[PDB]
Amino acid sequence: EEDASQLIFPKEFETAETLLNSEVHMLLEHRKQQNESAEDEQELSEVFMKTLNYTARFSRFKNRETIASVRSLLLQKKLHKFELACLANLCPETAEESKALIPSLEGRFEDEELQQILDDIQTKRS
């Protein structure tokens, strides 16, 4: 019944906050920093390792300010929070690509405004 294709999600996660690749990358790296210091500790699980090394491949950027920048430039518009991360990680090079991948963008915004949001994300990419 739930389907991200139509922005329909469980209420317990609709109320939940999506995270970016570079965001969770920084949070996980911060944890790992705490989780390898403070001697007399238990190593992180392999889950944490594979999630780290996954998101490390897909970090568009790294400093918290870059995350805050792409979040702020997105929230000023009228996009739904689900669109916030899928559109912030992939960085589709053209509005046509974003609208083809994301069906909710089709007719959601003028092509030039969606393209501007994309281009801004591109300019934020390290």
Partner: protein, 171 residues
């Protein structure tokens, strides 16, 4: 896709852990309990990020354990059907393509794969080149996919990817 939430849990603490180490011990127990696990309700809880509070520990009548309810923020990963994600090809076989997504993996049959992406079983590296050998898609190639169906298998998830949508390849 990754998330974080204020979860809550309750631990039963044995009386041996009372005294000065108590609330620290409750924390250590919670980190022992709910890290690195996946749930049929919330999906894959990656870790506790912080503890919102430790509740007042009710002493169980007739058995010495004290029950502490605890509220805590945790990062969590719950894929949904319909989501278009970055992934890395892990294994290319004529039976289908296998690919990893965070804690999870997906699998993509030749049925899901465009007809032009023929099998390359005869090369050393398993690939699905096209007939002119221009778009070379092989293992470990950072290939996009769209999660078209979710499945939970005993506190674990196993989605299924596809390649039917355009622009599902190299960036």
């Amino acid at each position: 896709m990754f998330y974080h939430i204020s979860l809550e849990h309750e631990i039963l603490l044995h009386p041996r852990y009372f005294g000065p180490n108590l609330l620290n011990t409750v924390k250590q127990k919670l980190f022992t309990e709910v890290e690195g696990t996946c749930t049929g309700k919330y999906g894959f809880v990656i870790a506790v990020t912080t503890i919102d509070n430790i509740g007042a520990g009710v002493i169980q009548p007739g058995r010495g354990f004290v029950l502490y309810p605890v509220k805590y923020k945790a990062i969590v990963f719950r894929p949904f059907k319909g989501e278009v994600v970055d992934a890395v090809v892990t294994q290319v076989n004529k039976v289908g393509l296998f690919t990893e997504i965070g804690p999870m993996s997906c699998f993509i049959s030749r049925h899901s794969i465009p007809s032009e992406m023929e099998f390359d079983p005869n090369s050393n590296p398993p690939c699905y080149k096209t007939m002119d050998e221009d778009i070379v898609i092989q293992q470990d190639d950072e290939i996009r996919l769209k999660i078209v169906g979710t499945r939970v298998d005993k506190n674990d998830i196993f989605a299924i990817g596809s390649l039917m949508d355009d622009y599902l390849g190299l960036v």
